[PDB]
């Protein structure tokens, strides 16, 4: 029975909620179950990035998240035979491998290849055995570190470049940006019909000749 200017209030309690209510008194104890695992895993793989393998630089899909950059699922295959890392080997040197990424641009390719060239350089490969062969970094840069990287390895920071002040020319001061936008929004609108008149006006030149 409504009274005098409320809202309409469709609240969803008609079904049966009392039975399937999930209370969260685990919440602070779950914070601790995870914390031990997070620690017990880091102590189990001692020299290794605690955060996990290295993930690639990647852009977010929809136009509202255009300009951000994420940590992706794994480095793509096309990326890898540029840096020269075999696809099955990278899975064993802390490089997430995603065999499912269609690369469409060279911009995001090189930007993402750089992290793999960068990874190599600051990577210390404990050799297979104590007395072991090539590509295992020397004992000098083996004693120097036992450091797990707390936090993500080389965190992807959304970073921008400053554009200094300009001298605006008398060409940028002539652009009617509100005008051309309406133009472009009209050309994408009517391009399809305008070509059907050209297809018809091209038939009238062949229909007039016959």
């Amino acid at each position: 029975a409504p009274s005098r200017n409320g809202m309409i209030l469709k609240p969803h309690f008609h079904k049966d909620w009392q039975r399937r209510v999930a209370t969260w008194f685990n919440q602070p104890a779950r914070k601790i179950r995870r914390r031990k695992a997070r620690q017990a895993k880091a102590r189990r793989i001692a020299p290794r990035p605690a955060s996990g393998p290295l993930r690639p630089v990647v852009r977010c899909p929809t136009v509202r998240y255009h300009t951000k950059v994420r940590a992706g699922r794994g480095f793509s295959l096309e990326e890898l035979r540029v840096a020269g890392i075999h696809k099955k080997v990278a899975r064993t040197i802390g490089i997430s491998v995603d065999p499912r990424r269609r690369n469409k641009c060279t911009e995001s390719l090189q930007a993402n290849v750089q992290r793999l060239k960068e990874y190599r350089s600051k990577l210390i490969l404990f050799p297979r055995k104590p007395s072991a062969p090539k590509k295992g970094d020397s004992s000098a840069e083996e004693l120097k570190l036992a450091t797990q990287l707390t936090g993500p390895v080389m965190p992807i920071r959304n970073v921008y470049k400053r554009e200094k002040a300009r001298v605006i020319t008398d060409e940028e001061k002539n652009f009617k940006a509100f005008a051309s936008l309406r133009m472009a929004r009209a050309n994408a609108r009517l391009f399809g019909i305008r070509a059907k008149r050209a297809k018809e006006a091209a038939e009238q030149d062949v229909e007039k000749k016959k």
Binding site: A1, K10, T62, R64, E163, E172, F175, A177, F178, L181
Partner: protein, 147 residues
């Protein structure tokens, strides 16, 4: 708390604030918003005008990210930038007109509300208003489009 509740002060009061003529029976009106057409019409029609009935056009599977477009007014443009880049202007004697990337501060559109300081600018955005064009132009400055 239960301590400051009118249910305390209603002890020894027989009807308990609900009147002894018409008692507090369970559900006299209906249950929920029930009877908008019938017998509750005076409410729905005089307080919620336009509740009942269809209107407009269906657009099934709408997604907000398609049509995402925040807005700035020229009222607060020099707020997006650190105010010292404004003080390192109206000065400098060169027509510096620092660049304001409205995209970087999270706005895909610049609308023309409010006064604008007499100062040259370059405003990079996605979609402009017409009056926001004229306010920047007439102050001396450019409107630069970004994809």
């Amino acid at each position: 708390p239960s301590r400051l509740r009118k249910t305390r002060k209603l002890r020894g009061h027989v009807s308990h604030g609900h009147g002894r003529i018409g008692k507090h029976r369970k559900h006299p009106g209906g249950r929920g918003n029930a009877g908008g057409m019938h017998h509750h019409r005076i409410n729905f029609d005089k307080y919620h005008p336009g509740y009942f009935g269809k209107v407009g056009m269906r657009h099934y599977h709408l997604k907000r990210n398609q049509s995402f477009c925040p807005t700035v007014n020229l009222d607060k443009l020099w707020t997006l930038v650190s105010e010292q880049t404004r003080i390192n202007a109206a000065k400098n004697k060169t027509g510096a007109a620092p660049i304001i990337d409205v995209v970087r501060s999270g706005y895909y559109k610049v609308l023309g509300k409010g006064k604008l300081p007499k100062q040259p600018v370059i405003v990079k955005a996605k979609f402009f208003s017409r009056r926001a064009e004229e306010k920047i132009k007439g102050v001396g400055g450019a409107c630069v489009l970004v994809a």
